[PDB]
């Protein structure tokens, strides 16, 4: 019920990285976070220490006693300290190669090598060169088969393209699942929301800085993995809080601080959006962070809201649900069972996520605002899939959401 994620971040380039780390930390019970790596990108080409992260983790240690009363599985402060390390200290592929290992690059290697069947995500909040150093070292020291196996267990989520090393990865390792997300600017909350709901809330709020340019431009790089019941982030066409990536595109260019650098790698492909795809989730996203900052400052469970818990057809697993059904049949999807741990009331909303599925037509859902819905599988849907989403919403303060996607493979 959790995904494995390692973040690499160019702390100091812009306050948004700090903002993003605060949100990730109050969401950390939903993940297996395995690295917080301070590194570079074209907006911050040199770095020397982890002091930004140290400061934020000190705040986390003050919030952790409260956070841990609100959900299971928050990582300990000691554990987070252990995975707070330096990555590459210089820029791009110019800091990749012989003698250039970092704590962060080695951390990535060790995570990918681990005997956990789950893949691991490595992200680029700045450049991707700490990931590139890891892959370069594996390529330089292991067999082809061992390199292919390594690549098969990795995924990269690159925000915007901020060094030439991400491009080097996409070009040289075409079997690596690689997203270069660019439509990361349309979902953000207001500065007043931040002041009132976030920054005022205790020690973690005090290390959440104001926006300089954009708020939390890098945050999609973990929201992609926030909701196992909504989306499998390795199926990048599904859509979810990190966006929807329907195809690979050629020559996806990075930011202006690396102009001219991508082109030497042509032709290369990267998954990227074909349409902004985060804003649709914004209400849920904003309410989520609001409630979690309440968790951070309330010592009593009773004093904050917690997410509702979906069940569909007596299946309580926090994962995408897969069903096979015949064309021209009706499928009952019953979310009775679902619960709320605060005793809130629930609202049920069923939708056809037609952007995400291979069926080209429309799909009728009866009683789509009720717990117990019925999906009409078209007679012409054979050989396609149909994605049906349950969105569950409580009436707590603020309203919190939960999801279950049902993927119906039609015969
Ligand atoms: Ca950044
Ligand atoms: Ca609730
Ligand atoms: Cl955007
Ligand atoms: Cl979408
Ligand atoms: Mg404060
Ligand atoms: Mg989406
Ligand atoms: Mg469709
Ligand atoms: Zn609050």
Picking from 123, 315, 353, 314, the residue whose alpha carbon sits closest to that of residue 231 is 353
Annotated binding residue 340? yes
Expressed in angstroms and rounded, the spacing between residue 314 Cα and the centre of ligand 8 is 34
Q: Any alpha helices (H) in 272-380, and if so which ranges?
A: 282-297
- Going 300 to 302 to 303 to 306, the CA torsion angle's sign is positive
Expressed in angstroms and rounded, the spacing between residue 218 Cα and the centre of ligand 1 is 6
Between CA 213 and CA 204 the distance in angstroms is 21
Residue count (the chain): 411
Expressed in angstroms and rounded, the spacing between residue 190 Cα and the centre of ligand 5 is 17
Picking from 81, 137, 84, 127, the residue whose alpha carbon sits closest to that of residue 106 is 137
Expressed in angstroms and rounded, the spacing between residue 198 Cα and the centre of ligand 5 is 8
Between CA 340 and CA 353 the distance in angstroms is 25
Residue 207, exposed/middle/buried by CB under 10 A (0-12, 13-18, 19+)?
Answer: buried
Breaks in the chain, after residue numbers (C to N greater than 2.5 Å): none
Q: What is the resolution of this structure in A?
A: 1.1
For residue 345, give the ligand nearest its CA: 2
**Domain annotation for the chain: domains and CATH numbers:** 1-301 (3.90.245.10), 302-411 (2.60.40.10)
**Per-position b or e across 252-267, b if 16+ CB within 10 A of its CB:** bbbeebbeebbeebee
Could you tell me the strand order of the sheet in which 330-334 lies?
330-334, 372-376, 365-366
Expressed in angstroms, the distance from the first to the final Cα of the chain is 29
The pair of three-digit structure tokens given for residue 401, joined into one six-digit string: 């959401």
Tokens 């920054």, residue located: 199
Q: Give the HSE-up count for residue 90: Cα atoms under 13 Å, Cβ half-sphere.
A: 9
Annotated binding residue 357? yes
Expressed in angstroms and rounded, the spacing between residue 163 Cα and the centre of ligand 3 is 20
Technique used to solve these coordinates: X-ray
Could you tell me the strand order of the sheet in which 385-394 lies?
321-325, 401-410, 385-394, 346-352
The pair of three-digit structure tokens given for residue 137, joined into one six-digit string: 């070292």
Expressed in angstroms and rounded, the spacing between residue 30 Cα and the centre of ligand 7 is 29
Query: Containing H/E element for 368?
Result: none
Number of H helices, E strands in the chain: 11, 15
Tokens 């704590």, residue located: 103
Picking from 151, 125, 126, 124, the residue whose alpha carbon sits closest to that of residue 138 is 151
Question: Phi/psi at 131 (nearest 5 deg)?
Answer: -65, -45
């Amino acid at each position: 019920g959790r995904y494995r994620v390692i973040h690499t971040t160019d702390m100091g380039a812009d306050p948004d990285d700090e903002q993003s780390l605060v949100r990730q930390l109050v969401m950390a019970n939903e993940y297996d976070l395995e690295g917080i790596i301070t590194t570079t990108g074209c907006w911050k080409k040199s770095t020397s220490n982890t002091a930004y992260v140290d400061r934020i983790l000190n705040a986390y240690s003050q919030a952790y006693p409260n956070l841990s009363k609100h959900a299971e599985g928050f990582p300990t402060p000691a554990y987070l300290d252990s995975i707070n390390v330096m990555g590459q200290r210089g820029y791009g592929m110019g800091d990749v190669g012989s003698g250039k290992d970092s704590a962060g690059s080695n951390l990535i290697i060790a995570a990918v090598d681990k005997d956990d069947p789950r893949p691991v995500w490595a992200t680029c909040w700045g450049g991707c060169n700490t990931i590139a150093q890891a892959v370069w070292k594996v390529q330089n020291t292991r067999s082809q088969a061992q390199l292919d196996a390594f690549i098969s267990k990795l995924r990269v989520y690159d925000i915007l393209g901020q060094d030439n090393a991400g491009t080097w990865l996409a070009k040289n390792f075409p079997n690596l699942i690689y997203i270069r997300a660019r439509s990361v600017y349309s979902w953000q909350p207001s500065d007043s929301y931040l002041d009132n709901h976030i920054q005022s809330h205790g020690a973690l709020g005090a290390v959440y800085p104001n926006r300089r340019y954009a708020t939390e431009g890098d945050t999609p790089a973990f929201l992609h993995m926030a909701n196992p019941g909504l989306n499998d982030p390795s199926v990048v066409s599904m859509g979810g809080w990190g966006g929807r990536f329907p195809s690979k595109q050629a020559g996806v260019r990075g930011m202006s601080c690396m102009s001219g650098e991508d082109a030497v790698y042509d032709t290369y492909y990267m998954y990227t959006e074909n349409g902004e795809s985060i804003k649709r989730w914004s209400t849920a996203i904003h309410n989520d962070f609001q409630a979690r900052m309440d968790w951070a400052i309330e010592s009593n469970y009773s004093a904050a809201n917690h997410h509702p818990v979906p069940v569909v057809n007596n299946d309580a697993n926090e994962a995408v649900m897969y069903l096979n059904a015949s064309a021209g049949s009706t499928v009952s999807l019953d979310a009775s069972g679902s619960s709320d741990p605060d005793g809130d009331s629930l609202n049920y909303s069923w939708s056809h996520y037609g952007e995400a599925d291979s069926y080209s037509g429309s799909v009728s859902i009866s009683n789509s605002s009720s717990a117990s819905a019925n999906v009409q599988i078209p007679s012409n849907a054979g050989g396609k899939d149909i994605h049906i989403l349950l969105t569950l919403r409580d009436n707590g303060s603020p309203n919190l959401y939960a999801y279950r996607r049902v993927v119906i493979n039609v015969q």
